[PDB]
């Protein structure tokens, strides 16, 4: 009661081959549902079309969501890892929940009291078993905030089952967060646990120099042949003929290759100058879209694929790309002046552009009287011999993703960036165990639904050690860092403003530095 | 909770060769910004001219100040210092937090109720690294009071960095405070610190009894020659000539001399009667001031300068001194019966008076027609075999000042008086920890920003012990004490009044005892 | 540095020390001899009490990049900051360390108090601006003054009640205890090390 459960740490270590980044935060956590696990479904939440139809449960528990790059690595930090370093991934984690207070409020006449209850508890357990459905990766809100001088509330967890329409099917299953073994905390007691992440592949945190395309001798030709000329070229009757070219430093393009460009799911292309669109509502009707037993869902961001080609910044996929939302924006049909639209160019080397054609193929039999017709490649999965480069990741972006439990999946690296791990860190979930208000003086077999108000309050550690693949570039001339541009502004970048409110102007991904193919 | 964390100690202790002093006191910390980082600059403040912009942050950050002498010494322990030793500087310094008490006022229908919040903590971190931008060793209020009865209150923590007008450059930077290990403490925990103090030359807390152009033998004449006479005499007709003569005990001007005195920066000479200065507003204009990026900044107290020459008290250069101000002096345009101007006079021996020419030069080559004209040195940078002093201390005034980090620093002692320290003690920065307001029963991302009014109080030991260099003096008759004069008065002085109100008639040096040069 | 050696205060607190403010009673009609003094402020931030000065100065002749903003004049030895030695004159260059300019001027350099690379195959003599590089020192501009302006201002006399407060522009000043300056940069084209002269007295021994 009177001694701290704890300190705070919140500052990052770099010893050269790792960087452990910790991070406190102090948090606030309501009492949700009125402590009742109640069944949800789009019926519930005003109706929806079948696409937006769902069946799930809310609970009373709020659950701790640090997927983030901003919750552990500061712009200063985020900046001194992308300049130097090839690749990071996270190797382990170390949270920690302390200086648990639970205040109890009590409204009477219009005037507000608030007074600790030392004797309160709450209950917070971690599933290391992933036995309950996992909802992180998802990329929702409740993230421990990005500038630790601000406290943030707990979000509320809820799960979502099998439906068919806004109802149950026979295998939609109900989860009782209350049949877990919980851990009750007074304030004067504090929760630590670890975990050590699986082995998983490097982040590639750096940009190819080289085009897939481009990976010869530019003054050596080949020994290698190619259909050159098809007809003889003039006379006046030029006929059938079978000429072949040696591909060489001028036909380029001819030349024989072993590789190919990274899968593909073509996306359609709009502009960010609305007068170059179209002037119809394609939002959904133009967007490509997978279907799952009968109803369909946004490929967004979807696989991995280069945002525009050469010169052209102003067009972007439409799903094809995250977008944030600057500090403050709204919900609902904000204005582009108020997201952030992400630009997957630095891929162009490996992946196709994801608002172009993978390629053209053939698609009949010249002969005499036929002559060749080919169409275009829009959707192609993966063929022995491509490679690909997955999408980047953003110090406002997710940091991994569970990969889902199924016996079949393919390079399990999730489509918005990210770790993909089969044992993603557990969720932590937490609530204000309940207290009910004075009973009756004769026994009533209801169960009590008058309850005491109160909310717990406390401070939250997260320390997570990375590993970190230093670049060795054996380049001649400068490469491209990131910087703060050196111009004078109103207000500098990623600070808090004349209001005291904190904000980050722009998206900064990981590709930076180069790196031959 | 039931158990105090320390006890009072506030006295000092007398070794021979060194002296501890402690000190304790009661301290307020409010809760500034209302827990945000916000921007300020010079525009925020209510605009200002070009001399005055700036651009800094405020932070929710209270810090301790104890630079000042009077803040350790009691008048009578500065006076034991002062009349018995040649020099002083400190050794190492103990600063302890304890006995902490976080109240929570929550003020409603116009009743307001105190009481203590027994979970709710603080963080109380010390910057080791100086990383943070150091801001003590400005001369800021804030300091533990100088009577030990009284309780201050904790002055709130603020920056700046580059400008450029009202605006931030790029090399602005922000440092958010949250960012540093802090250590959490509740009522029943303490903060112990110790530091020791570098190696730093003693402060020369005596007057010399030689002047630095009189120390010949006055019974003896030099072997040395010098020109003495230039033209024949008299007759009618006084011609060129070419006399040499030996410096001797009547020409004690015309003599040899091997050293220099210290450097000037000339400054403007103001009488305490206003009836003696010139009627303009020479405040500004007639001052002595750098020049830096651009801007003009006043040179006070500026580099180390006799105030007067003998028998002219009522003059004092216009910045070239440190002005206190009496007990309860106003902030703006107060007249001179309520400040108090120290008196540097006690260094003409070495140091060349603050507002007069520090030489004569030649600047022309006499000849037979063109004859030896002769230039005021008003600025005289040092040379070599010069010798100075350096300003006094002031039991009101500065202990230390943080050297700047640059690469070239000539004498750094700091210009305000002091010891200059490399590595000063660091800044122990304190702020009372967020503790939420009931938050919304439904989840919403933004941060939250209601939140429990609360301030928190304690009390705070410093104690410093310093080296003394013990007066040997071979001197025949009686020196000058300092003694508070014999003759009865209303009220005692460094007493209290009638009225409970601690006050310090007149500032007090340390140059007392004097020795030969 | 991304502080202004002359902005190292807190911004939120006031001085516990003075400094004359009023010299005059400002209005009625007859404004007369008086004394105020002020505490310095966030406000008043440069009126306040200082423990450091700017490093040391010896003052350059301002030339503008663009020719059409300089003087008709051959000064390119007249207008030169230049030391005298043994009879014979020698320019100051690149001279001791200082900012190239202020705040938006990156039009201006001091004449000689930068160093100036040649682009590759520029010739030796005559060579127009469009052939060298230009070094910029501006990022010292928080400790050293600026090589093409006054270093301070100094008082040249004793005011009093007939005679007015006068003063006059600094423009070479030596180091002053309490000075405190930033070294020249390095250029990856530029020189590693020099050689310290074998003499028996030299300040600050830095190229
Ligand atoms: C939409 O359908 C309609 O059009 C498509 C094509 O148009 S499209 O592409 O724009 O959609 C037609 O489909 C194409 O043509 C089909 C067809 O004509 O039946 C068919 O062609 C393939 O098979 C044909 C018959 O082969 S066989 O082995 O079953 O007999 C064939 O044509 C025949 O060629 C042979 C031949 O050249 O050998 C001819 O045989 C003659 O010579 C042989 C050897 O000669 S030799 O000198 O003695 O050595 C003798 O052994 C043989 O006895 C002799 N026969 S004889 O009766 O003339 O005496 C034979 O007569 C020809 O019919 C096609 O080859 S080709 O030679 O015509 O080029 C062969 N395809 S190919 O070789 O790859 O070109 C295919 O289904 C299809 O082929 S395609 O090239 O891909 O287009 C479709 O039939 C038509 N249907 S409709 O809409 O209902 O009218
Ligand atoms: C504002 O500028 C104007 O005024 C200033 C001075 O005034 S001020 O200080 O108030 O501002 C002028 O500047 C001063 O004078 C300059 C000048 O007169 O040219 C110049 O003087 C220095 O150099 C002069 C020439 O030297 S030389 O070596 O280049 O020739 C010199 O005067 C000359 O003296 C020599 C000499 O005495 O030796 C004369 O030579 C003659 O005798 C030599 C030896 O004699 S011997 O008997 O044979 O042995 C013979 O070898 C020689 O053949 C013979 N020459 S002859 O033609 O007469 O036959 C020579 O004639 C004189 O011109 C100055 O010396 S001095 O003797 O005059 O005292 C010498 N400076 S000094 O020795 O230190 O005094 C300087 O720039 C400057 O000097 S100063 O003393 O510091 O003032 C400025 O020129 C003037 N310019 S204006 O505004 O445009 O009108
Ligand atoms: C270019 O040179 C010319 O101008 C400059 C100044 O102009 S400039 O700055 O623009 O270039 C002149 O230089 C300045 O003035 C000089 C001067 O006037 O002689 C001189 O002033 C200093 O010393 C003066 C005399 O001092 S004394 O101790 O030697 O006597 C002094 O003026 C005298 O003031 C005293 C005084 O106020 O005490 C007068 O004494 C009278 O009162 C005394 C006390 O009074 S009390 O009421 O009895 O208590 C009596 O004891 C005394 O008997 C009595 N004398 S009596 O005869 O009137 O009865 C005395 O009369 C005055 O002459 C200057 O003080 S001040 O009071 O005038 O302000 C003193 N400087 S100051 O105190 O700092 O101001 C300096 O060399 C110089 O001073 S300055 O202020 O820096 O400018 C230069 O002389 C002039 N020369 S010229 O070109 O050839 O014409």
Known sequence: ????????????????????????????????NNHL????????????????????????????????????????????????????????????????????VTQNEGTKTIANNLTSTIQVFTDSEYQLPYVLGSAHQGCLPPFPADVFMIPQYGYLTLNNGSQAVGR???????????????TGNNFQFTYTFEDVPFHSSYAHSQSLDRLMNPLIDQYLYYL?????????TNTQTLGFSQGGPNTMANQAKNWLPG??????????????????????????????????????PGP??????????????????????????????????????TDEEEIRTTNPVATEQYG?????????????????????????????????????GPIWAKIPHTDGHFHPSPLMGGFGLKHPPPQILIKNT????????????????????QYSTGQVSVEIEWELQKENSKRWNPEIQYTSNYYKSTSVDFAVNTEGVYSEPRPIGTRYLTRNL
Request: glycine share 8%; hydrophobic share 30%; proline share 5%.
């Open 434 to 453: 309940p207290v009910p208000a004075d009973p009756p003086t004769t026994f009533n077999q209801s169960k009590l639904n008058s309850f005491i108000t």
């Open 1 to 32: 009661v009177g001694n701290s459960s704890g300190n705070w740490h919140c500052d990052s270590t770099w010893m050269g081959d790792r960087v452990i980044t910790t991070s406190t935060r102090t948090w606030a956590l309501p009492t949700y």
């Open 37 to 104: 696990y109640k069944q949800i479904s789009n019926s519930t939440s005003g109706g929806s079309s079948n696409d937006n139809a769902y069946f799930g449960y809310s609970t009373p528990w709020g659950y701790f969501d640090f997927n983030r790059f901003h919750c552990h690595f500061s712009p200063r930090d985020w900046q001194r890892l992308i300049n130097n370093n090839w690749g990071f991934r996270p190797k382990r984690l170390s949270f920690k929940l302390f200086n648990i207070q639970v205040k109890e």
């Open 172 to 186: 939609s299953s109900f989860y009782c967060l209350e049949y877990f073994p919980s851990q009750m905390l007074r």
């Open 360 to 396: 053209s193929v053939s698609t009949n039999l010249q002969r005499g009287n036929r002559q060749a017709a080919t169409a275009d490649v829009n959707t192609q999965g993966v063929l022995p011999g491509m490679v690909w480069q997955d999408r980047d990741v953003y110090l406002q």
């Open 263 to 300: 899968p593909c799911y073509r996306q359609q292309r709009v502009s960010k100058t609305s007068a170059d669109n179209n002037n119809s509502e394609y939002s959904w009707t133009g967007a490509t879209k997978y279907h799952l037993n009968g109803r369909d869902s946004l490929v967004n």
């Open 304 to 341: 991995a694929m280069a945002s525009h080609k050469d010169d052209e910044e102003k067009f972007f996929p439409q799903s094809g790309v995250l977008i944030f939302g600057k500090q403050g924006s709204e919900k609902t049909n904000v204005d582009i002046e108020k997201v952030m639209i």
């Open 228 to 236: 050159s000329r098809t007809q003889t070229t003039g006379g006046t």
